[PDB]
């Protein structure tokens, strides 16, 4: 991670995390299961469904991705016909 750039002096972001991850506005990160396209003839339908299912990240990985991304990717996006707009918020979280 480049904490201080050379041109603008700003903090940069890694593009791998934005290529293979998705941040919901509530702080959660969404990802794909590793190996969901490799050797599908060798795996059971239940395992294939487990691989095709999306998954969340835990607190340490989420904080790592927040450190590796800038503030532009932590904004509120109002997309037209966004499937994850219902998941952008959190409800009934009694902490």
């Amino acid at each position: 991670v480049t904490y201080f750039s050379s041109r603008k002096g700003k903090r940069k972001t890694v593009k791998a995390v934005i290529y293979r991850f998705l941040r919901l506005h509530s702080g959660l990160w969404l990802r794909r299961k590793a190996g969901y396209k490799k050797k599908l003839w060798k795996k059971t339908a239940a395992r294939k469904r487990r691989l095709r299912e999306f998954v969340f990240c835990n607190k340490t990985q989420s904080k790592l991705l927040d450190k590796m991304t800038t503030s532009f990717w932590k904004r509120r996006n109002w997309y037209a016909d966004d499937p994850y707009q219902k998941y952008q918020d959190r409800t009934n979280l009694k902490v």
Binding site: L28, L30, E53, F54, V55, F56, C57, N58, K59, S62, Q85, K86, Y87, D89, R90, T91, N92, L93, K94, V95
Partner: protein, 354 residues
């Protein structure tokens, strides 16, 4: 560490040494019979019945009923052996049994059944359906005398009321006809009670037709304490039980407290407790006949509720407990995206300040 068994072990009696001289069962059916016989014994370890409700195991049931008929067992066995020998002496019966072409007089079979062993089957069926548990709570009787109840659906249509049948309220709208063998020197009381259907109290039941002081068999001659009321079970809660109980009495019982008016359309007045009724009339009355049937909601219960009871038809529903969900985590690790939908209040987008 080893502990000693708190009683006898299961397979500790047979000798382990010299197994070849010991007889084995070569039949899965033999082993299944032995296993089902051994499973019904009160073992000292944790068993399945102890956890899944043997109903306190053995219980001393109080018998409130007529004594069994005193018959000569020796003469009975003698005449039965004679009848069996006469039946076996034939040759056409043997030919029919060999050719597998033989019929059975089901009517005579049912008659002899209700004559000799029908009472005990009816008693155990009532115990299974929970009649005694809700009528006396501590006592089960034997229906010594039979009781044939039948509803008239038309001119030639007669629907019987057996032990546990299902009768539609449309067929049960009118008062039924009852029959039972009795001499012209005894008095009987008939009571139709609805065990389920009381909207206010759970531990109470409804009256539908109470008629006491029956001379012999003439039920119409006896004074009806409670006029007949058709079954009115709710639409949601279905399959209520309606039981005709017939009691034999000694004295001419007279009571002004259990009397009902001629309309008798008040549900507060039509609230019964058979336990207290039998506690009041325990000196003379003794239950001898029983016939219970199931009944659900039909298109006549709305009419009975509106016209007769002067009410609105109450509609119930069988709701299920809500599905269990764990405590929602801040970071649900490796959970599918639909984890956030299990804790959604409504499937409607809520824009807080926008």
């Amino acid at each position: 560490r080893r502990a000693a068994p708190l009683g006898p072990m299961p397979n500790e009696d047979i000798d382990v040494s010299d197994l070849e001289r010991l007889k084995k069962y070569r039949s899965f059916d033999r082993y299944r019979r032995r296993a089902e016989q051994e499973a019904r014994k009160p073992h000292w370890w944790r068993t399945y019945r102890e956890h899944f409700g043997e109903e306190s195991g053995p219980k001393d049931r109080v018998d409130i009923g007529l004594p069994p008929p005193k018959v000569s067992r020796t003469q009975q066995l003698l005449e039965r052996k004679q009848a069996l020998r006469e039946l076996r002496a034939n040759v056409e019966e043997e030919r029919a049994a060999r050719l597998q072409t033989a019929r059975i007089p089901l009517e005579a079979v049912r008659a002899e059944w209700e004559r000799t062993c029908g009472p005990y089957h009816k008693q155990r069926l009532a115990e299974y359906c929970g009649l005694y548990r809700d009528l006396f709570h501590g006592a089960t009787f034997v229906p010594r005398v039979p009781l044939h109840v039948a509803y008239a659906v038309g001119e030639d249509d007669l629907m019987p009321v057996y032990h546990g049948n299902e009768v539609t309220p449309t067929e049960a709208a009118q008062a039924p006809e009852v029959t039972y063998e009795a001499d012209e020197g005894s008095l009987w009381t008939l009571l139709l009670t609805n065990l389920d259907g009381h909207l206010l109290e759970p531990d109470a039941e409804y009256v539908h037709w109470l008629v006491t002081n029956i001379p012999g068999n003439r039920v119409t001659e006896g004074q009806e304490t409670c006029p007949y009321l058709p079954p009115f079970p709710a639409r949601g809660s279905g399959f209520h039980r309606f039981a005709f109980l017939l009691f034999k009495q000694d004295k001419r019982i007279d009571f002004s407290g259990d009397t009902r008016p001629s309309p008798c359309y008040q549900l507060a007045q039509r609230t019964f407790h058979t336990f207290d009724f039998y506690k009041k009339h325990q000196d003379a009355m003794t239950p001898a006949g029983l016939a219970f049937f199931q009944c659900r909601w039909d298109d006549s219960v709305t009419r009975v509720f509106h016209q007769l009871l002067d009410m609105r038809e109450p509609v119930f529903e069988f709701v299920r407990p809500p599905p269990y969900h764990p405590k929602q985590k801040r970071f649900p690790h490796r959970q599918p995206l639909r984890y956030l939908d299990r804790y959604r209040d409504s499937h409607e987008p809520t824009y807080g300040i926008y």
